[PDB]
């Protein structure tokens, strides 16, 4: 039972260094909370089963790019927990990390064993549902903003339009509430990209990152989607774009 997306946004309050998507919050690890390596592949295969199955029902049983995205981000989230590279750990996702420790060992080399095991298993686990963690979350946040933009602008066009030689954004009570409601969205989206983009730089710079196809937080959305413009994205998120001036500015 995965709640419909855009019913919960990325929460930057729990960990203020990085914002966590709600999809990762609802990641089903329940069996991982209960040689051992082959014993661990089974417990993880159930969680990889339920998860990939529920996300499809969340997708209205449809086969489309949106579904393959939800499987992909959910797949990599598993690796970050199994490798110990997960930045989400809060509540019982800390418990999974501690469970895998006594299973994989805590030794200095044992951090290297986790990667090897997830290197072979990943080709399997992927089928059971049907790159650094921050790099993936910029791909997911990017797909959020592009499908959340036309809705907010649409809800605004209904309540604010027409010269009724001045705009409805002054003297019309319903429109002035609609404009502030837009402010909340574009504010959260701005404060989000603030936190998340720094986590991209604090990783790429502090850890050796061999992927040079993305040197900037902008480059992720540039390779993820087509009609993305670097300039326009800056204006929209700063509320200076040629829309939010024509709606919500009375002068």
């Amino acid at each position, epitope marked *: 039972y995965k709640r419909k997306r855009r019913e919960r946004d990325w929460d930057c309050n729990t960990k203020k260094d990085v914002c966590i998507p709600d999809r990762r919050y609802q990641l089903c690890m329940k069996e991982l909370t209960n040689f051992r390596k082959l014993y661990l592949k089974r417990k993880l295969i159930y969680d990889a089963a339920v998860e990939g199955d529920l996300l499809l029902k969340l997708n209205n049983y449809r086969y489309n790019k949106d579904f393959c995205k939800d499987i992909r981000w959910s797949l990599g989230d598993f690796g970050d927990i199994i490798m110990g590279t997960d930045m989400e750990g809060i509540g019982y996702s800390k418990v999974v990390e501690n469970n895998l420790r006594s299973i994989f060992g805590t030794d200095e080399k044992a951090q290297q064993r986790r990667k090897q095991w997830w290197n072979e298993s990943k080709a399997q686990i992927w089928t059971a549902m049907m790159e650094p963690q921050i790099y993936r979350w910029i791909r997911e946040w990017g797909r959020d903003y592009v499908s959340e933009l036309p809705t907010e602008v649409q809800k605004l066009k*209904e*309540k604010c*339009d*027409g010269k009724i030689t001045d705009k*409805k954004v002054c*003297k*019309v*009570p*319903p429109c*002035q*509430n609609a404009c*502030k*409601s837009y*402010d*909340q969205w574009i504010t959260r989206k701005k404060n989000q990209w603030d936190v998340l983009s720094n986590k991209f730089i604090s990783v790429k710079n502090a850890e050796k990152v061999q992927t040079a196809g993305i040197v900037t937080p902008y480059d992720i959305l540039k390779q993820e989607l087509d009609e993305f413009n670097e300039v326009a994205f800056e204006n929209e998120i700063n509320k200076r774009d040629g829309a939010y001036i024509e709606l919500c500015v009375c002068s």
Partner: single-chain antibody
Amino acid sequence: DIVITQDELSNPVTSGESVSISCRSSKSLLYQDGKTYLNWFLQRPGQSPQLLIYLMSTRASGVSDRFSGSGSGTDFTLEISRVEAEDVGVYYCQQLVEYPLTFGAGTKLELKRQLQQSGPELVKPGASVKISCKASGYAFISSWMNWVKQRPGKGLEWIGRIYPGDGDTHYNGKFKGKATLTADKSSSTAYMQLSSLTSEDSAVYFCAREETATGGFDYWGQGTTLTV
């Protein structure tokens, strides 16, 4: 200036006897989005206003399911089914089509058988006394603080509203010069300083938090008694 008027309840209402209060505007309360903007409140005999029904039929959370919001968009009606002794009081409507926000005269009812507002204030004529409204919620920066003027034995007069986030102000034309609407952010406190007092100004004043997302006035204060 939009006209609003309500009817009077002629006979004392027996408990459980149903009833319907009717509201009539002078203008279509529908909007460009095809939504009828309207509200229905109830003031307990001794309490602050409480929202019941908003956006025509849509019910307010916490309000009993037996209050109906029907309307044709210039003609609206509430409905009290199996009326309760708690509901005895005065009911008001609100219309959002354009400023000023106008609350109707109100309809009586018979029994047949939060926000921190500043304390009372008594000052000479021609004075100015700021009064506060303290909202503990962090929505104070994201909400609309509305101010309301309750004269003794009278309906509601909307003074204006201020949004602490961008510091916007909407002023009722009547009070255009008599109101000073500020807001404290750091302590999340709203302030209203009335200009040089006239004897007419003696009345209780209420603040109403409006969610920027719904837009109903759910949260009201204990009141502020002002005396000349």
